[PDB]
Amino acid sequence: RVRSITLGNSTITTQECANVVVGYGVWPTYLSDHEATAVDQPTQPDVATCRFYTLESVKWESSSAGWWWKFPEALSDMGLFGQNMQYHYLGRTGYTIHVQCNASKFHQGCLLVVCVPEAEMGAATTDHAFNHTKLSNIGQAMEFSAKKSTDQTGPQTAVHNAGMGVAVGNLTIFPHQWINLRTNNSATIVMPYINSVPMDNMYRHYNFTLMVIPFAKLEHSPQASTYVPITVTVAPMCAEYNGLRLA
């Protein structure tokens, strides 16, 4: 029923079926080894930096609007992956994202776990430019709101517009997975490297934003647990950076 996966260290556990969703039917892979003439030569992490990075868990209460993380910026202080982001200038990588909800049989609700490529967000105070720390901190979960935002230096965090000016119910053409606590508690999304260029600066460009939005709100007896933790575990797969040597 259960299966243990190890990537260097440590081991996480998962179920035998788990409904893995590959991004656009494309498994993440390398640049097919046509790296001739030594003018634009790439470099692997060691191999590898491919280990499970677990983030700090969030608390899904009954009034939680949702959360988001911007990648690769949510793994900036994360081991060797966070050091290759400052030792190299250009980089490309793919990801495996696990989102587990540790609920009971007496908790109800539904979550939508989206991976939105190039989730360009709008400002709360329009005509104003926002701070970069109100978009993504170093590993923190930036959260949506139920009301509209009037912040003079932040983004628009109204969840029914999803920060991008669209309808939140239409966020299913992106690679997504439903977590209905009646049926599931986990979600595996495997995202490849999607960009217009084969490599880019990792500190400057957010490739995709992972979004966890509750569509049916969390509802329970008052005698149960009231916070229902959600754990996001990210393993970067097939990372690649620019060559740092001569000739």
Partner: protein, 241 residues
């Protein structure tokens, strides 16, 4: 939002077609602007105008040419001829369409020295007649040198050994270009401007030369003021560890 130059990783495809001599030299460049009028105002502006075909008057074309010692190309000339009236008191008229004559005079052919000259009717001088409002007229000149290639540089004289004019040779005669109105008159005077565009076709080059550092002072010399070899900085070394 501006401006940065970036590295920006590129897949291996290695284009080089935009660096060929045909793609480098073969661009339609404006080489001369000819001004002439329906009626004569002054010695400068007269019923007709002329231009000896040279490639040393537009500096952006001249520097791309003078990267090679010996060139050989065909010329595609095309004319953008516009007309406008002078600042008269009244402009109310009913004019027929203006017809222009662009005459190419070969090396060896007779040049006009006035209006109504006999050289405008010479059968060996190819002319182009074009009425205003139509498509722009276009001529095609072949390789017209007596020698085997044009020479952008001539380390020599043109007179008795060691006498004459330095750097001048008759191996770069491409001909003349004469512009006039075929119409006899108008009710009120009309000024015309004829923009001349060159497009070198089938370009071949020999003996590449160093690019010019100094600016140009004359269109028939390689004279120059002295200049620094590059721009200046403050230190030979670098700071900010």
């Amino acid at each position: 939002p501006s401006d940065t130059m970036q590295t920006r990783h590129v897949i291996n495809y290695h284009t080089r077609s935009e660096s060929s001599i045909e793609n480098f030299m073969g661009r339609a460049a404006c080489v001369y602007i000819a001004q002439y009028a329906t009626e004569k105002v002054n010695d400068e502006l007269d019923r007709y105008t002329n231009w000896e075909i040279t490639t040393r008057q537009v500096a952006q074309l001249r520097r791309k040419l003078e990267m090679f010692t010996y060139m050989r190309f065909d010329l595609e000339i095309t004319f953008v001829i516009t007309s406008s009236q002078r600042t008269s008191t009244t402009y109310a008229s009913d004019s027929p369409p203006l017809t222009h004559q662009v005459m190419y005079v070969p090396p060896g052919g007779p040049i006009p020295k006035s209006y109504e000259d006999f050289a405008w009717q010479t059968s060996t001088n190819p002319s182009v007649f074009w009425t205003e409002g139509n498509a722009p007229p276009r001529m095609s000149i072949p390789f017209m040198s007596v020698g085997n290639a044009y020479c952008n540089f001539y380390d020599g004289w043109s007179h008795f050994s060691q006498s004459g004019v330095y750097g001048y040779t008759t191996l770069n005669n491409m001909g003349h270009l004469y512009f006039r109105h075929v119409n006899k008159s108008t009710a009120y005077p009309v000024n015309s401007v004829a923009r001349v565009y060159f497009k070198p076709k089938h370009v071949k080059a020999w003996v590449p030369r160093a690019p010019r550092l100094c600016p140009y002072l004359k269109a028939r010399n390689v004279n120059f003021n002295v200049q620094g070899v590059t721009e200046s900085r403050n230190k030979i070394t670098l700071d900010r560890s």
